[PDB]
Amino acid sequence: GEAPNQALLRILKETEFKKIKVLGSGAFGTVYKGLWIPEGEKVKIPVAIKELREATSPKANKEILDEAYVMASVDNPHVCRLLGICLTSTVQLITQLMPFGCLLDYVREHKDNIGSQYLLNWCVQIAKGMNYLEDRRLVHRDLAARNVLVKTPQHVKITDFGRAKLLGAEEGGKVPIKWMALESILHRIYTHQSDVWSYGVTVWELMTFGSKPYDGIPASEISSILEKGERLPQPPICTIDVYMIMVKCWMIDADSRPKFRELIIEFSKMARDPQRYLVIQGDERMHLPSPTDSNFYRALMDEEDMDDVVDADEYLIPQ
Numbered sequence: 001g002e003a004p005n006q007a008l009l010r011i012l013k014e015t016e017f018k019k020i021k022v023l024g025s026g027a028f029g030t031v032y033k034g035l036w037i038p039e040g041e042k043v044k045i046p047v048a049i050k051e052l053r054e055a056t057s058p059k060a061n062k063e064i065l066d067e068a069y070v071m072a073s074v075d076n077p078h079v080c081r082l083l084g085i086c087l088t089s090t091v092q093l094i095t096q097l098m099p100f101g102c103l104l105d106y107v108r109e110h111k112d113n114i115g116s117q118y119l120l121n122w123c124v125q126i127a128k129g130m131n132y133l134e135d136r137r138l139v140h141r142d143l144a145a146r147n148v149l150v151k152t153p154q155h156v157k158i159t160d161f162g163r164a165k166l167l168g169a170e171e172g173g174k175v176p177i178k179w180m181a182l183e184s185i186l187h188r189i190y191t192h193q194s195d196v197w198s199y200g201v202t203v204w205e206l207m208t209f210g211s212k213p214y215d216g217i218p219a220s221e222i223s224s225i226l227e228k229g230e231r232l233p234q235p236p237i238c239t240i241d242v243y244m245i246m247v248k249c250w251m252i253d254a255d256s257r258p259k260f261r262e263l264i265i266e267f268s269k270m271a272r273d274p275q276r277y278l279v280i281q282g283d284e285r286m287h288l289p290s291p292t293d294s295n296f297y298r299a300l301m302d303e304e305d306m307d308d309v310v311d312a313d314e315y316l317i318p319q
């Protein structure tokens with residue numbers, strides 16, 4: 001009773017793009033800021049380029065192709081856009097460059113300029129992302145502020161689909177316990193509802209401006225804490241209304257937790273009266289710079305002339 005997935009998968013020529021710089025280096029993988037130019041399209045598209053670092057090179061190519069499979073299949077303004085893959089000896093995943101980086105980092109660097117209206121909107125855009133995933137029957141299994149990226153301060157998108165699964169499909173090292181639901185931790189169960197719990201943690205990270213959840217606590221302890229019924233603390237800036245939503249995402253009974261489409265509604269409502277629900281000093285006059293429009297802003301980011309720059313979101317196949 002599932003539809004045929006007719007998404008296209010595009011193969012990019014290694015000649016078509018250039019790596020400007022290294023966004024991140026990790027034992028697991030390395031990512032590059034770069035620029036992609038389809039031959040004869042007269043466009044330049046800012047891109048991020050990913051190569052994995054598994055113990056064996058074939059096993060690395062397995063994990064990254066699954067991720068491409070997922071991204072090629074989703075199309076939604078709050079989910080990260082795949083452009084294609086490159087068949088170099090180690091496979092390269094090519095996606096839309098998100099110039100402001102991940103949310104967790106962004107919220108740390110700019111906490112003194114981040115207002116209630118921004119935070120409630122990220123929370124809306126995020127539930128929209130996940131609810132879209134729910135429609136697609138996709139469980140992310142690693143929702144977290146490090147895996148939300150910022151196209152602009154007005155616009156975020158979910159990312160890191162490496163662990164993603166279809167609901168109930170058959171699938172353990174360095175799992176992220178802190179964001180995990182209890183049923184997930186005790187019985188390796190995972191659901192949209194399990195995702196909802198992670199959304200809760202994710203929201204808390206934003207309301208705490210990047211605080212580490214269960215800071216100073218060993219992962220082994222966490223399952224026991226949650227079993228006692230302890231949870232994460234109420235962030236200072238958080239009215240009870242908001243905190244209550246977090247706490248529902250952290251109920252033991254998963255059917256009890258809210259649904260992403262319900263989260264959209266609720267945070268969407270508060271975004272109409274933001275200072276009623278988040279209390280932040282100086283909230284009234286905080287500005288986050290968004291020089292999306294300037295070509296010059298682009299030129300600085302990738303260090304080139306940019307008259308023919310195009311963001312992935314305005315670049316649509318058919319080619």
Ligand SMILES: */C=C\C(=O)Nc1cc(Nc2nccc(-c3cn(C)c4ccccc34)n2)c(OC)cc1N(C)CCN(C)C
Nearest residue numbers: 023024025031048096097098099100101102104105146149
């Ligand atoms: C949370 C770290 C981070 O994302 N930093 C970051 C990210 C970007 N833009 C971007 N755009 C698309 C994809 C990625 C991306 C995906 N994955 C798995 C990554 C791993 C490591 C790094 C980036 C990844 N990133 C960016 O664009 C300018 C800058 C940036 N920063 C701020 C680099 C410094 N951070 C590590 C703090």
